[PDB]
Design a protein around this ligand. Sequence first.
Ligand SMILES: *[C@@H]1O[C@H](CO)[C@@H](O)[C@H](O)[C@H]1NC(C)=O
Lengths: 49, 49
Amino acid sequence: NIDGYFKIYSKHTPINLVRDLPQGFSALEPLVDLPIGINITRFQTLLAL
Amino acid sequence: CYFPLQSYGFQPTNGVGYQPYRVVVLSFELLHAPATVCGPKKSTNLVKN
Ligand SMILES: *[C@@H]1O[C@H](CO)[C@@H](O)[C@H](O)[C@H]1NC(C)=O
């Protein structure tokens, strides 16, 4: 989030179970840009049960 | 102490001053936000070679 613009990049790939953060390379293509213009200093996740 | 509320009597035979009018006020502001509510409609047909 800079100059009043919020940017989001993403990249999805299947993974082989146990190993966490495998070796490899994958660039994150842009997804979403919004000109919200808001200060952000903290954030929190969400999850469904 | 008099009644604050009142209502116009809009019969069709009223004069132009008494004729009801619908007026819309279009207010514009710049509070230094990146928001934009306009857009151009100019696009000439492309040419090649
Ligand atoms: C963000 O914080 C800065 C510095 O405190 C301030 O100047 C700015 O107006 C703030 N913007 C918003 C949207 O809170």
